[PDB]
C-alpha cells in the first residue's frame, strides 16, 4: 500500500499538477489499456499510476511526449 504521497509532491510541485498527471495517467491505464511500468501488488489503478509517477517515470512533460508519440503512431497507421 501507499501510506503518504508527500514524496510525490516534493518532485512534482504545487501538489495540484500531480492531480492532473495522475488523472491522465490512470485514465490511460484503465480505459486506454496501457501497461503498468512497475510490477503491481494487485492494487487499484489510481495507486499504481501514483506509484509509477513516484518512480520518476511519469510527469506532465513525458506524458505530453508519450501523447505526441501516440499521435505519430496514429499518423503512421492511417498512412
Amino acid at each position: 500500500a501507499r501510506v503518504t504521497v508527500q514524496d510525490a509532491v516534493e518532485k512534482i510541485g504545487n501538489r495540484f499538477d500531480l492531480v492532473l498527471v495522475a488523472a491522465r495517467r490512470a485514465r490511460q491505464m484503465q480505459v486506454g489499456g496501457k501497461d503498468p511500468l512497475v510490477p503491481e501488488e494487485n492494487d487499484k489503478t489510481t495507486v499504481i499510476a501514483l506509484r509509477e509517477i513516484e518512480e520518476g517515470l511519469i510527469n506532465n512533460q513525458i506524458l505530453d511526449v508519450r501523447e505526441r508519440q501516440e499521435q505519430q503512431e496514429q499518423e503512421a497507421a492511417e498512412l
Binding site: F16, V19, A23, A26, R27, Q30, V31, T45
Partner: protein
C-alpha cells in the same frame, strides 16, 4: 442507513431524505466549503451535480461505473434550471450567453 439509488423528488431531481423512505444523506453547505478549501473540483461536481442532481447525468454515471469506466460528464444541474424557471416566471428575465 445506506442508499445506492432510490426515489427522487419530482419538483427537483434530488434524492429524498430519511430512513423511513430510501433516502440518502444531505451534503451540507459547510461540507461544500470544506471541499472548496481543498481542491476536488472534479469531486465536487461529481457529488453535487452527477451523484445528486441530473437524472440524465447520474444514469450515465451509473452505466459507466457498471461498465468499467471511471469517466464522468457533469453537464448542468437540473435544480439550477428550476431556479432559472422560477426567477424567469417573474418580470425578471435571465439568459445564458454563448
Amino acid at each position: 442507513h445506506a442508499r445506492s439509488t432510490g426515489s427522487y423528488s419530482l419538483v427537483t431531481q434530488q434524492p429524498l431524505g430519511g430512513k423511513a423512505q430510501f433516502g440518502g444523506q444531505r451534503f451540507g453547505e459547510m461540507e461544500v466549503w470544506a471541499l472548496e478549501a481543498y481542491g476536488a473540483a472534479y469531486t465536487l461536481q461529481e457529488m453535487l451535480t452527477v451523484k445528486s442532481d441530473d437524472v440524465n447525468g447520474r444514469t450515465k454515471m451509473y452505466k459507466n461505473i457498471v461498465d468499467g469506466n471511471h469517466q464522468m460528464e457533469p453537464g448542468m444541474p437540473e435544480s439550477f434550471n428550476v431556479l432559472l424557471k422560477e426567477i424567469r416566471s417573474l418580470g425578471i428575465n435571465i439568459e445564458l450567453e454563448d
